[PDB]
Amino acid sequence: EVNSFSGYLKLTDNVYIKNADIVEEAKKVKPTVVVNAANVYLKHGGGVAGALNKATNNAMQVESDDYIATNGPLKVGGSCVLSGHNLAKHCLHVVGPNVNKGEDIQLLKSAYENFNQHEVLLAPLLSAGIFGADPIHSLRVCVDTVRTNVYLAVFDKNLYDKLVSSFLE
């Protein structure tokens, strides 16, 4: 079956959320598009990016290095489409701002706007975790910006409960 998302809570007509590891979701669903929370040189050294690259047995990193050699780095707020490998048909590598490194939180709207070029996506909460953005603000930007169908996987039950409560106020 195609894009077999299960156990998500529908927040708006196009935004769904689950307490789950995005890697486990991608292996089970094999979505058309999985979003990676990338950096501008596509160096998947840890966090979400590291876990998705390890699940491809480093094929995503080798492919990424070859993309960067030919095209140069991405811009913060930008994206590129590469192979999904065993995780999806395509991986959309999106660069959200890293606020802990001084990047502008306003670019989080540009980052989510890349999702609108794909009908259905499995994605993480952009710029959250060690990128330093307020996760409740990131969910609000997603809901206000994405118009195609996005399934958010957040791998932390405590944060998932805070996000759902904040949305439902």
Ligand X SMILES: CC(C)[C@H](Nc1ncnc2[nH]c(-c3ccc4c(c3)C(C)(C)C(=O)N4)cc12)c1ccc2c(c1)S(=O)(=O)CCC2
**Per CB under 6 A, 134 contacts ligand X:** no
Region 101-120 residues binding ligand X, contact defined as CB under 6 A: none
Stretch that binds ligand X, among 46-54, 83-91, 104-112, 161-169 (CB under 6 A): 46-54
37 binds ligand X (CB under 6 A): yes
Each residue 51-90 as x (binds ligand X by CB under 6 A) or -, in order, gives x---------------------------------------
Binding-site size, ligand X (CB under 6 A): 20
8 A C-beta contact, residue 91 and residue 36: yes
- Distance in Å, CB of 2 to ligand X, minimum: 22
Q: Which of 129, 145, 150, 151 binds ligand X (CB under 6 A)?
A: 129
Window contacting ligand X (CB under 6 A); options: 11-19, 43-51, 64-72, 103-111: 43-51
What's the per-residue H, E or C state across the chain?
CCCCCCCCEEEECCEEEEECCHHHHHHHHCCCEEEEECCCCCCCCCHHHHHHHHHCCCHHHHHHHHHHHHHCCCCCCCEEEEECCCCCCEEEEECCCCHHHCCCCCHHHHHHHHHHHCCEEEECCCCCHHHCCCHHHHHHHHHHHCCCEEEEEECCHHHHHHHHHHHCC
Residue type at 124?
A: P
Q: Which one of 124, 141, 142, 163 is in contact with ligand X (CB under 6 A)? A: 124
Q: Which residues bind ligand X (CB under 6 A)?
A: 21-23, 37, 47-48, 51, 124-125, 127-131, 135, 153-156, 159
